[PDB]
């Protein structure tokens, strides 16, 4: 009534070896690595047989086709830990069981799943458990002519692609598990019938089908928290009779990944594009006018050129972000994993860090050299000259490009947030790096303020007539300091507060502080420093005369 074929020195099983048996319910073929071949029709016909197990036959190169044929009551089929290369043949069992289960197991050497592998397999519903197998790909119509209650491709690491037409002829599936499969994308057809989807630890599944394709989806479980946001759209024994109005998706999105677009609020989508343009032309013209100047470059003009270049890099970053927002308008979650972890996000983060640090360092150097020239003004031989300026600015470039490269080297990640700012503060190294950068910016602003105050106290004449000239000095120097402060203080305070793991704001509102307060320097530097000075205006009129538009 039960067959236990174990540890036998059998190399070949002849065809129809089990003829004459009618009361067998179970057949077990386990730990028989001496076995290498099974003849076709080895199980040609049995009445009461329902359960078959093959568990360890490492030397089994393959099973001849038609080994399992014309078995109505065959219900559970298992083939595990076998060195089979050709996919086993099951298309001719012609079973009639209502809940047939087909199990393929630990067959690392199976290369692929042939198309139409289940024609004539069972007249009723079936479940497939393809755990662990080393399939390379699945071709079109691999599932055909049967209601497929459950499909589980769990832990098929070697699997790389499933043909878009694999579900063309199949009904369902009702349950689909692709966990740890590192599959690229799901088939475009047949997913409408899915009730529940499991894709945990499938990091390579960066893109998912549209929400409308998942009409019947309940009880979904994905690997990327962002993907669950696609299901926010409105239309015990867990006994029930009606599906929930909306799917329940896990894991829930984290704080770093709110269910929003890249640009949080609608109005920002405009304000960015304006700050885009205002942040490009001016700094370009400043570069264009000061680089095509007949007259020799003096230290402040070189510093102005480099400051405008840094702000131009900032504007380019903002332009990249705005273009990304425009391209992914309204359905960011689909492209979120692909772009947030692609080269684009890393480039954007590098641009942000490099441009911001270079601009801050250049502003500090400009203020320091202004203070040096105004304090030791009588000693006309101590004036800083172009060679030292170029040396200091090359050092500044190295510092700015080094600090902006560490996130690409693992010290931090630009991939933590959509806007690609270095918000990775988990490990202490990243926390100290971020705090160091923020404190350097704060100290930069403080030294700028101190140098300006010293300039004002040095120019002031405590005895001679200075009542009407000190006021202008104070006024415009306060304008400069206030522009720097309104660009720095909010961003710096919030960043330092959130870098100690005490967030005082949500990431969605963080977006506003980018548009409204971050590029303030990047768009106000050329006007306060470059556009309004006599030298730049005179060069600009020279260019206009050259082009005749004056």
């Amino acid at each position: 009534t039960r067959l236990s074929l174990a540890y036998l020195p059998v190399k070949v099983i002849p065809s129809q070896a089990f003829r004459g048996l009618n009361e067998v319910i179970k057949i077990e073929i386990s730990q028989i690595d001496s076995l290498e071949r099974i003849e076709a029709n080895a199980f040609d016909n049995l009445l009461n047989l329902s359960e078959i197990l093959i568990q360890n036959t490492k030397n089994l190169r393959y099973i001849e086709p038609g080994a399992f044929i014309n078995l109505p009551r065959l219900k559970y089929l298992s083939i595990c830990n076998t060195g089979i290369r050709k996919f086993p043949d099951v298309t001719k069992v012609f079973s009639s069981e209502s809940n047939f289960i087909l199990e393929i197991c630990d067959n690392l050497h199976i290369t692929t799943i042939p198309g139409n592998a289940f024609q004539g397999m069972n007249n009723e519903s079936v479940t497939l458990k393809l755990y662990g197998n080393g399939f390379e790909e699945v071709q079109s119509h691999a599932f055909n002519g049967t209601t497929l209650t459950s499909l589980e491709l769990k832990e098929n690491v070697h699997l790389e692609k499933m043909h878009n037409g694999a579900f063309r002829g199949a009904t369902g599936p009702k349950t689909l598990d692709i966990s740890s499969t590192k599959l690229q994308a799901l088939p475009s057809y047949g997913l409408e019938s899915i009730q529940r989807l499991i894709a945990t630890s499938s990091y390579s599944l960066k893109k998912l089908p549209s929400r409308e394709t998942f009409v019947n989806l309940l009880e979904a479980t994905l690997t990327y928290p962002i993907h669950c946001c696609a299901f926010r759209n409105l239309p015990d024994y867990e006994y029930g009779f009606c599906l929930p109005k909306t799917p329940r998706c896990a894991p829930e999105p984290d704080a770093f990944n709110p269910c929003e677009d890249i640009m949080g609020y609608d109005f920002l989508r405009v304000l960015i594009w304006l700050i885009n343009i205002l942040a490009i032309m001016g700094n370009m013209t400043v570069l264009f006018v000061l680089l095509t100047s007949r007259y020799k470059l003096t230290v402040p003009r070189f510093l102005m050129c480099n400051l405008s270049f840094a702000d131009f890099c900032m504007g380019l970053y903002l332009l990249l972000i705005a273009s990304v927002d425009s391209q992914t308008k309204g359905q960011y979650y689909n492209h979120a994993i692909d772009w947030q972890t692609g080269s684009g996000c890393s480039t954007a983060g590098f641009f942000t860090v490099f441009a911001s640090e270079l601009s801050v360092y250049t502003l500090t150097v400009i203020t320091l050299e202004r203070w040096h020239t105004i304090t030791y003004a009588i000693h006309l031989d101590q004036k800083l000259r172009l060679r030292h300026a170029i040396l200091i600015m090359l050092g500044g470039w190295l510092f700015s490009s080094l600090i902006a490269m560490l996130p690409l080297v693992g010290v931090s990640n630009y991939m933590k947030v959509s806007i690609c700012f270095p918000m990775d503060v988990e490990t202490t190294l990243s926390q100290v790096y971020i705090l160091t950068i923020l404190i350097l910016n704060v100290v930069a602003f403080f030294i700028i303020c101190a140098c300006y105050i010293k300039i004002y106290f040095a120019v002031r004449n405590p005895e001679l007539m200075a009542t009407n000239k000190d006021t202008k000095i104070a006024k415009k120097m306060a304008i400069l300091i206030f522009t720097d402060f309104t660009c720095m203080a909010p961003i710096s305070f919030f960043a330092i507060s959130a870098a100690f793991k005490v967030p005082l704001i949500t990431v969605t509102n963080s977006k506003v502080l980018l548009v409204l307060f971050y590029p303030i320097n990047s768009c106000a530097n050329p006007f306060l420093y470059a556009i309004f000075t006599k030298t730049f205006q005179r060069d600009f009129f020279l260019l206009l005369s050259k082009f005749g538009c004056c």
């Binding site: 386990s30 197990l53 197991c105 459950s150 832990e155 349950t175």
Partner: protein, 110 residues
Amino acid sequence: KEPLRPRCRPINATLAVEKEGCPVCITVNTTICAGYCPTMTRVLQGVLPALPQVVCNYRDVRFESIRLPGCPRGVNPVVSYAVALSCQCALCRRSTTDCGGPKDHPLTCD
């Protein structure tokens, strides 16, 4: 415990220990774990999914070491085996456990 229907718990056993190339069989007393725990099968086979059914298995396992009596050279002198501390019945981890059917094989070597 109860003489009839105890639960998953650790029980002592006599396991045969050898290694790759020892012509001699060693037999040592260590801990395995076995017993019963509730099981389920879904009557409504269909739209509702299948109900998982657990098997008694380890939760924390330590390791003991032993030196065999002059086994052939070329292999590390000291071999190790496992000792079971506590167990509960959960799904057999295929990547870690080989959960098969009735075998009743002797646990002594031959």
